[PDB]
Structures are given as structure tokens and as C-alpha cells.
């Protein structure tokens, strides 16, 4: 529990702001949108501010009407099982509890989600509905951003109709402005310069618990071996040492790491911009009131920023390219960049294919539009923050209490842009040699993907490819339980890979567990060993009869894990068909039976795009 800031409304009065945009964000997208809407306010006569709901007490929403032309916008993202982002849990819980009256409160909601999930945009829909039940009035339609298609475009569209609607309601009318100012530091003790740490200065050198997203633990890589036999791709097994970190975890939890961008990529960005990346500086918020004093830890160098604090590989959002347009000396190129923010027509077409589909990162755009030469300091203000990457812990704390295992596939592909893109975290992780001990800044995030409380309950695990990661922890655990004399029910693994001689992950370890009985059944689908595909859902269909017994009479818990929906949906449909046939029942009730298990904690998921 943090110490809440003072009434955000009072803060709005003191700073003459009439619009506030809260963000429910985890990976930073919603925070981005909020900040953009907040900055838009200026071009429409109003004055806004974005804010994190966690640091405030929304109850003061009831005081918002005290400000004339006041309006509140919520950009909310949804996480695992239609839940609120962690930084919006307080707000969510309040909405349900409170009975306060929001009469006079004008609002709008833009929800960030992804259609390939059960509860699509659940959080956005709930905020939109609940605020109305409390008496507040909707000033504009609920927006439904779909990250499976193109979230950025949904925001542009919604945003384009939002301001006109806001201006018409409050009767107001409709330019490059920087958020930060640059302060170069010539004389400065090195001990005051950030070098990559996320929280307090020197927090990476001086490690002191507890450890978290704000103060990550630098675990030493003790093992990094290639898991796949072939060379088609690179799948790796890493073991991080969390000894003397006081970190706790259970199989099914996730480990997050803060990677470092490819140094060569960084060098070239500086080199093409004719800038010195070793200059030490700080970007100070021009708004001396806001608590966000810097876009990232300062003072620091451009090289450290580009390396640890900024994202330089993902396709830039439309607003970033719109602000860069001013720096392209070639007219036709200034036009293209300017048009990227368009909500339709050729501008949108070009953005979707030349930037997004081609997966062009900022360096590629700087190369393909040679007249674009923006000042380095401004570019650092526009680029989004480099995020942590989650991994399903592939070990059990009952067996490896002081070590966190990671199972991952290195990302490397050819983009339509013509170059080879390299996954940030996996390239960085791949280069970590067990060895100056190789360290990975990290932290654990509790999930709800857990082994059954009672050791006797049957476990059905479906995890193709790298989706087996958490199950390696489960199996070690169940194996550990049979060794403690405890009674363990059936433990079935449905795994899939392309060929047993190419990427059969943990082939040796799994054979072991099967032999010692820790794995009641090891069912593997080799998708490419024959002309037709053989997927895990084909094996589930085969063993329908038996799985039905464990499900309907054994109380079995089902687990699905892997890359993002097809697979997860396929499975789901298989289980529908199994239940529908052996109930027996109609398809509709088959869906209901399975949906029930999901809510009754007997069908968990851990999918990721
Ligand atoms: C909850 C959760 C659990 C996860 N568990 C694991 C796990 O245990 N093991 C694991 O390996 N991963 C897992 N991940 C994924 C992991 O967090 C990273 O997303 C992954 O490792 C890639 O990150 P990166 O930094 O290496 O690449 P990034 O720099 O993040 O690039 C990734 C992006 O590259 C693009 N891309 C990938 N291939 C192509 C292509 N061929 N063509 C066009 N675009 C493509 C996509 O936009 C993809 O999102 C999990 C993710 C989540 C959210
Ligand atoms: N997609 C991306 O591929 C990269 C590697 O992912 P990964 O290593 O975890 O997995 P992967 O190696 O791509 O897939 C693992 C196994 O799942 C199979 N599979 C493909 N589609 C499936 C489906 N719809 N239903 C059931 N199984 C399916 C694959 O078969 P085939 O590949 O032979 O179809 C393969 O045998 C990731 O970036 C992921 O996002
Ligand atoms: C572990 C995980 C779970 C998710 N669960 C859901 C979900 O239930 N519903 C949904 O609509 N989107 C879901 N999403 C997609 C996010 O809502 C979407 O990517 C959003 O853009 C992320 O915003 P952020 O960067 O501001 O956190 C999930 C994403 C991850 C990574």
C-alpha cells in the first residue's frame, strides 16, 4: 500500500487544468495514449494532465464537477481473465464497493485489449458501465482498441471523433511543443550519473531487498544451454541464481527481466544523427508541477538511455513520426511522415505497410528517409520506454528454491523492410555466458497458474513448443511430491514440436520423469514428421474417453500454455467436443461446462502473443 497523493481535483484547480486522463497500463501502451490525449487538450483550448490512478483516490471524482468544463478520461488495458492492470486494482475494487454519487461528472473511456482473449476489453467495459451506474454522464462512446488488429489505428480513429465531440459539447475551438527541456552537464561527479539502473542511483551496484519492478535483483546466470538439437532456430535454457535475494516463487509464476538494446544498433543511431552519445544530460519536465521530472532516470548519457531506457526496435507510433516530420529537409519525406497520423487514405496505408508490416524500427526509418535528421535530445523524449520481458519460470521452488529457470526461443527474423530484426531480450539473454559475473536484472510476478492444492488431483497439461516452460516446473514438483511419500494423481503431458531431432525441448529430462513414473503419460505431437500436421489437440481427441473420466469423475485440472488464438482456441474447441460427446450434451452446454471449469479454477491459461 503506497501513500496516496493529495486530491487530484485540487491539483487540477491549482494548475488550471480541466481534463485528466488516468491510465491502467502494464506494458506502457495505455500510459502512452493518456499522455497523448492530455497533450491534445492544449490544441482545443483546454488544459489537461495524465495520471496514474494508483497514486490517487478516485473517490475525489465526486469533486470533479467543481471545475467548469471538467472531463475525465480513462485509457484502461485488460490483463489475464479480464482483470484490471495492477496499477488500477485499487480503482477497480473501489468501483465495486462505492455507492458515491458522480452526478455532474462527464467522462469517456478508451479500452486497450486484444480479441484473441476470452474477456475482450473487460476492464474498459466495466469502467464505462459502472461510472454511468454511479450517476456520471458519458461524453463520448466507449472505444474498443484491438491489439490483434492494430491498436494504434483504433486510437487514432476514436481520438479523431473524440475531440470534435468534446469541443461541440463544451463549445470550444480547435504548434510543435516539447514536454522536456535539455540540460547538458559539463562538470559533474560520475557518482550522480545513472548507468542503466531502474530505481535509485546505484541500485544495481548496491543491492538491498525487497526486490521488484522498481528495484530488480541482478541474478547471475549460472547456465545457458541450447535446448534444441537442430539449427533451424535457437531455443535456450537459462538458470538465474536468486540466492540471498529473499525472493519467493512457485511454479507457474513469471520472471521479468530488463534487457539492454543491441549496442551496434545504438551506435548507428548516434552515428546517423551525427550526435555524441557520451554527452551527459537530463531532460527536465517543463511543467515544474508534475511528479514526472524526467522521461527516464537522469542525469545520464544518450548511450545509456538508448541502451537501457528507451525502445528503439518496435515500429514507432504515428505521433512520434508526426513530430519528426519537422526535421526532414526533403519535402516529399516530410509529407510521408506527416501523413502517417492520418486516420484513413494513403497515409494510413503507408503507415500500416511501410512501418508496421515492414517492422521498420527508428534506425530503419532514419536510413530510408535520409533527409530526416532530428536532434538526439528530442528523439529521446519521443521514443517509448524499454519494457521488461516476462518468461514462465521453468522450475519449481520446491526443488530449486534459489534458482529461477527460463525456457525461451530467440527471436530473429527477416522483415519486409529488408533487414534482420533481433528480439531485444532474447538476443541479450542468448549472449549471457555463465562466466565479471553475467547478471540479469530481474524480479518475479505472481500469477494464478498453479498446481492443484491437493497432490491427488489429476493434472492435464497442454503446452506446444516453448509452451512447456511452466510444466517443467510442475513435473519437477509432482515428481518431488511422489518422493515425499505423498499420493499424486495422474499427471499427463501433451507436448508438441516439429521433429524429435530438431526442437524436442527437454527430451532427456522428460524421458526421465516418464520412466520414474512422475509422468503418467508423455504424449508428443511431431507436427512435421509426416505430410499432415499432428498437433496436441489431435492427441487430446484420441484420448477423449480417458480425459473425460479424469475431468468428469477425477476432478482434473486442465492447463494450456503457449504462443497466441489458434492453438489455445483449437484446444478449447477439442475439449468442447469431448464433453459434448461424453456428457452427453449439446454443443452450447458443452461450452458452458468448460467455461464453468475455468471459473471454478479447473482450466487455467497462460498464453502470450
Ligand atoms: C506472460 C508471458 C509469458 C511468456 N513466457 C515466455 C516463455 O516462457 N518463453 C518464451 O520464449 N517467451 C515467453 N514470453 C514472451 C517474451 O516475454 C517475449 O515477448 C519474447 O521473448 C520476445 O521478446 P524479445 O525482447 O526477445 O523480442 P522483441 O524485441 O520484444 O520483439 C518481439 C516482436 O517481434 C515481432 N516478431 C516476432 N517474429 C516475427 C516475425 N517472424 N515476423 C514479423 N514479426 C515478428 C513481434 O511483434 C513480436 O512481438 C512470454 C510473454 C508473456 C507475456
Ligand atoms: N508463432 C510464433 O512462433 C515462434 C515460436 O513459437 P514456439 O517455439 O513456442 O512454437 P512453434 O515451434 O512455432 O510451435 C510448436 C508446435 O506447435 C505447432 N502448432 C502450430 N500451430 C498449432 C495449432 N494451431 N494448434 C496446435 N499446435 C500448433 C507447431 O507446428 P507447425 O509449426 O509445424 O505448424 C509446432 O509443432 C513464436 O514467436 C510464436 O509467437
Ligand atoms: C498476460 C497478458 C494477458 C492479457 N489478457 C487480456 C485479456 O483478458 N483481455 C484483453 O482484451 N486483452 C488482454 N491482453 C492484451 C492487452 O490488454 C493489450 O496488449 C494492451 O494493449 C496492453 O496495454 P499496456 O501496454 O498499456 O498494459 C493481455 C496481455 C498480456 C500480455
Amino acid at each position: 500500500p503506497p501513500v496516496k497523493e493529495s486530491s487530484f481535483v485540487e491539483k487540477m484547480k491549482k494548475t488550471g487544468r480541466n481534463i485528466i486522463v488516468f491510465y491502467g497500463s502494464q506494458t506502457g501502451t495505455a500510459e502512452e495514449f493518456a499522455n497523448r490525449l492530455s497533450k491534445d487538450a492544449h490544441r482545443y483550448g483546454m488544459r489537461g494532465m495524465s495520471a496514474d490512478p494508483e497514486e490517487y483516490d478516485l473517490a475525489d471524482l465526486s469533486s470533479l464537477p467543481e471545475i467548469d468544463k471538467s472531463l475525465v478520461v480513462f485509457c484502461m488495458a485488460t490483463y489475464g481473465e479480464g482483470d484490471p492492470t495492477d496499477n488500477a486494482q485499487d480503482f477497480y475494487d473501489w468501483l465495486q464497493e462505492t455507492d458515491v454519487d458522480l452526478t455532474g461528472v462527464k467522462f469517456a473511456v478508451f479500452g486497450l485489449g486484444n480479441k484473441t482473449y476470452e474477456h475482450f476489453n473487460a476492464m474498459g467495459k466495466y469502467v464505462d458501465q459502472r461510472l454511468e451506474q454511479l450517476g456520471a454522464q458519458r461524453i463520448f462512446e466507449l472505444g474498443l482498441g484491438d491489439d490483434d488488429g492494430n491498436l494504434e489505428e483504433d486510437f487514432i480513429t476514436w481520438r479523431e471523433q473524440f475531440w470534435p465531440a468534446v469541443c461541440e459539447f463544451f463549445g470550444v475551438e480547435a504548434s510543435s511543443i516539447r514536454q522536456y527541456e535539455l540540460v547538458v552537464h559539463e562538470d559533474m561527479d560520475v557518482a550522480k550519473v545513472y548507468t542503466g539502473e531502474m530505481g535509485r542511483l546505484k541500485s544495481y551496484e548496491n543491492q538491498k531487498p525487497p526486490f521488484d519492478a522498481k528495484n530488480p535483483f541482478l541474478a547471475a546466470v549460472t547456465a545457458n544451454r541450447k535446448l534444441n538439437q537442430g539449427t533451424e532456430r535457437h531455443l535456450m535454457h537459462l538458470e538465474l541464481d536468486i540466492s540471498d535475494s529473499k525472493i519467493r516463487y512457485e511454479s507457474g509464476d513469471h520472471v521479468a527481466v530488463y534487457p539492454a538494446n543491441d549496442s551496434a544498433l545504438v551506435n548507428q543511431i548516434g552515428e546517423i544523427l551525427g550526435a555524441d552519445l557520451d554527452v551527459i544530460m537530463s531532460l527536465n519536465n517543463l511543467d515544474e508541477e508534475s511528479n514526472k521530472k524526467h522521461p527516464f532516470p537522469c542525469p545520464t548519457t544518450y548511450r545509456t538511455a538508448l541502451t537501457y531506457y528507451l525502445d528503439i526496435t518496435n515500429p514507432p507510433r504515428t505521433n512520434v513520426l508526426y513530430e519528426l516530420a519537422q526535421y526532414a529537409s526533403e519535402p516529399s519525406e516530410q509529407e510521408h511522415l506527416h501523413k502517417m497520423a492520418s486516420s484513413s487514405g494513403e497515409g494510413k496505408e503507408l503507415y500500416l505497410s511501410w512501418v508496421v508490416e515492414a517492422r521498420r524500427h527508428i534506425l530503419a526509418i532514419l536510413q530510408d528517409y535520409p533527409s530526416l535528421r532530428p536532434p538526439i535530445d528530442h528523439l529521446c523524449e519521443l521514443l517509448p520506454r524499454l519494457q521488461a520481458r516476462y518468461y514462465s519460470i521453468a522450475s519449481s521452488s520446491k526443488v530449486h528454491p534459489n534458482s529461477v529457470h527460463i525456457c525461451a526461443v530467440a527471436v530473429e527474423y527477416e522483415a519486409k523492410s529488408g533487414r534482420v530484426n533481433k528480439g531485444v531480450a532474447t538476443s541479450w539473454l542468448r549472449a549471457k555466458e555463465p562466466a565479471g559475473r553475467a547478471l540479469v536484472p530481474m524480479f518475479v510476478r505472481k500469477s494464478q497458474f498453479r498446481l492443484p492444492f491437493k497432490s491427488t488431483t489429476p493434472v492435464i497439461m497442454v503446452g506446444p513448443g516453448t509452451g512447456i516452460a511452466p510444466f517443467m516446473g510442475f513435473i519437477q514438483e509432482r515428481a518431488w511430491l511422489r518422493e515425499q511419500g505423498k499420493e499424486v494423481g495422474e499427471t499427463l503431458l501433451y507436448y508438441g514440436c516439429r521433429r524429435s531431432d530438431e526442437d524436442y525441448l527437454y527430451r532427456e529430462e522428460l524421458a526421465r520423469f516418464h520412466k520414474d513414473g512422475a509422468l503418467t503419460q508423455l504424449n508428443v505431437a511431431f507436427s512435421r514428421e509426416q505430410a499432415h500436421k499432428v498437433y496436441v489437440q489431435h492427441l487430446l481427441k484420441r484420448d477423449r474417453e480417458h480425459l473425460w473420466k479424469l475431468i468428469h469423475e477425477g476432478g482434473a485440472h486442465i492447463y494450456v500454455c503457449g504462443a497466441a488464438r489458434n492453438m489455445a482456441k483449437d484446444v478449447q474447441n477439442t475439449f468442447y467436443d469431448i464433453v459434448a460427446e461424453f456428457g452427453p450434451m449439446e454443443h452450447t452446454q458443452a461450452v458452458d461446462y468448460v467455461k464453468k471449469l475455468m471459473t471454478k479454477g479447473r482450466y487455467s491459461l497462460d498464453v502470450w502473443s
Side-chain angles (χ1 to χ4, degrees), residues 7 54-55 73 95 104 204-205 229 232 359 372 380 388 391 394 439 448 490 516 584 598 605:
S7 159
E54 182 165 44
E55 302 176 6
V73 175
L95 290 170
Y204 273 10
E205 190 181 14
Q229 311 75 192
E232 201 182 75
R359 293 293 300 182
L372 174 55
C380 292
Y391 291 88
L439 301 168
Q448 300 184 56
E490 278 183 60
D516 312 319
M598 299 192 154
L605 283 121

Side-chain angles (χ1 to χ4, degrees), residues 24-31 77-80 82 85 112-114 117 119-121 147 151 607:
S25 175
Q26 204 145 299
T27 310
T29 311
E31 195 181 324
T78 305
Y79 278 76
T85 57
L112 292 73
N114 182 326
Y117 288 80
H119 315 67
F120 170 63
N121 261 297
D147 196 40
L151 183 62
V607 295

Side-chain angles (χ1 to χ4, degrees), residues 262-436 438-508:
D262 173 283
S263 56
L265 201 57
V266 167
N267 296 350
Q268 285 182 300
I269 289 169
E271 193 215 317
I272 202 172
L273 289 186
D276 184 330
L277 310 189
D278 297 293
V279 172
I280 296 171
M281 57 71 233
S282 304
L283 288 174
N284 311 320
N285 200 322
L286 284 177
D287 178 310
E288 299 180 4
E289 300 304 354
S290 182
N291 306 297
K292 191 173 182 177
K293 298 295 187 165
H294 310 292
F296 44 77
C298 289
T300 193
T301 71
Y302 292 120
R303 187 184 302 289
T304 297
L306 290 174
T307 302
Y308 312 79
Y309 303 133
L310 307 177
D311 181 279
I312 61 178
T313 60
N314 284 320
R317 304 268 174 173
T318 64
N319 67 296
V320 169
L321 296 180
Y322 186 82
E323 287 288 302
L324 292 170
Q326 67 182 309
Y327 304 113
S329 63
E330 180 54 43
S332 59
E333 290 177 2
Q334 188 186 191
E335 186 82 65
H336 289 326
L337 293 158
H338 179 78
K339 279 290 168 294
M340 303 284 188
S342 192
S343 49
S344 60
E346 53 151 288
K348 181 169 175 178
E349 289 164 295
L350 197 63
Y351 177 67
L352 294 183
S353 66
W354 194 79
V355 175
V356 187
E357 183 66 17
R359 293 293 300 182
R360 279 191 167 67
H361 38 65
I362 189 59
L363 176 61
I365 287 177
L366 288 173
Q367 296 178 330
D368 293 349
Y369 283 154
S371 71
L372 174 55
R373 296 309 176 231
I376 183 82
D377 62 292
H378 195 172
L379 183 58
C380 292
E381 153 175 348
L382 296 169
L383 299 172
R385 287 299 300 283
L386 184 62
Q387 305 294 307
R389 272 66 167 166
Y390 295 82
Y391 291 88
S392 304
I393 305 181
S395 58
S396 153
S397 46
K398 299 273 166 285
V399 181
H400 299 80
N402 297 299
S403 187
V404 166
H405 293 184
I406 285 181
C407 172
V409 54
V411 173
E412 182 169 3
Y413 59 98
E414 335 159 300
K416 304 284 287 296
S417 69
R419 39 276 272 189
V420 171
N421 286 171
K422 302 277 258 56
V424 182
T426 54
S427 289
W428 175 77
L429 280 177
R430 178 178 187 167
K432 292 289 176 180
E433 51 205 59
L439 301 168
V440 178
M442 56 73 96
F443 64 97
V444 173
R445 175 178 192 291
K446 294 177 186 171
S447 83
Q448 300 184 56
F449 200 76
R450 290 274 187 294
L451 269 178
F453 294 107
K454 288 178 297 172
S455 74
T456 55
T457 301
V459 157
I460 299 178
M461 307 167 292
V462 187
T466 59
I468 191 174
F471 301 135
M472 289 314 296
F474 278 22
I475 296 158
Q476 284 165 23
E477 194 147 307
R478 302 274 281 192
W480 179 78
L481 294 171
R482 275 161 76 278
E483 298 169 359
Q484 301 314 80
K486 293 178 182 55
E487 177 187 4
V488 192
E490 278 183 60
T491 299
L492 292 72
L493 173 61
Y494 286 82
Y495 168 73
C497 68
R498 311 185 179 185
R499 296 191 164 81
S500 57
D501 41 67
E502 176 65 31
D503 51 20
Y504 185 150
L505 312 175
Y506 299 107
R507 191 181 57 203
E508 282 69 60

Side-chain angles (χ1 to χ4, degrees), residues 499-564 566-567:
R499 296 191 164 81
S500 57
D501 41 67
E502 176 65 31
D503 51 20
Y504 185 150
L505 312 175
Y506 299 107
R507 191 181 57 203
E508 282 69 60
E509 296 83 333
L510 293 161
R512 168 86 302 179
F513 292 123
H514 192 193
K515 185 171 183 169
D516 312 319
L519 268 183
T520 317
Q521 274 186 53
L522 171 49
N523 299 311
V524 187
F526 301 110
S527 66
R528 314 189 181 178
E529 224 135 283
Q530 57 296 300
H532 57 281
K533 294 295 192 183
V534 174
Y535 291 144
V536 298
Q537 55 267 44
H538 292 147
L539 302 186
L540 298 163
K541 178 65 171 180
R542 184 194 66 189
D543 311 328
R544 52 188 174 300
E545 195 294 85
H546 183 56
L547 297 181
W548 170 238
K549 160 182 293 175
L550 305 182
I551 290 175
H552 187 77
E553 306 179 357
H557 277 224
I558 302 179
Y559 302 84
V560 178
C561 176
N566 252 89
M567 193 282 302

Side-chain angles (χ1 to χ4, degrees), residues 57-77:
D57 161 33
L58 281 300
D60 286 303
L61 256 182
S62 68
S63 283
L64 194 56
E66 296 174 359
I67 308 174
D68 300 333
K69 288 179 180 51
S70 78
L71 168 66
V72 57
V73 175
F74 296 100
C75 297
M76 313 298 271

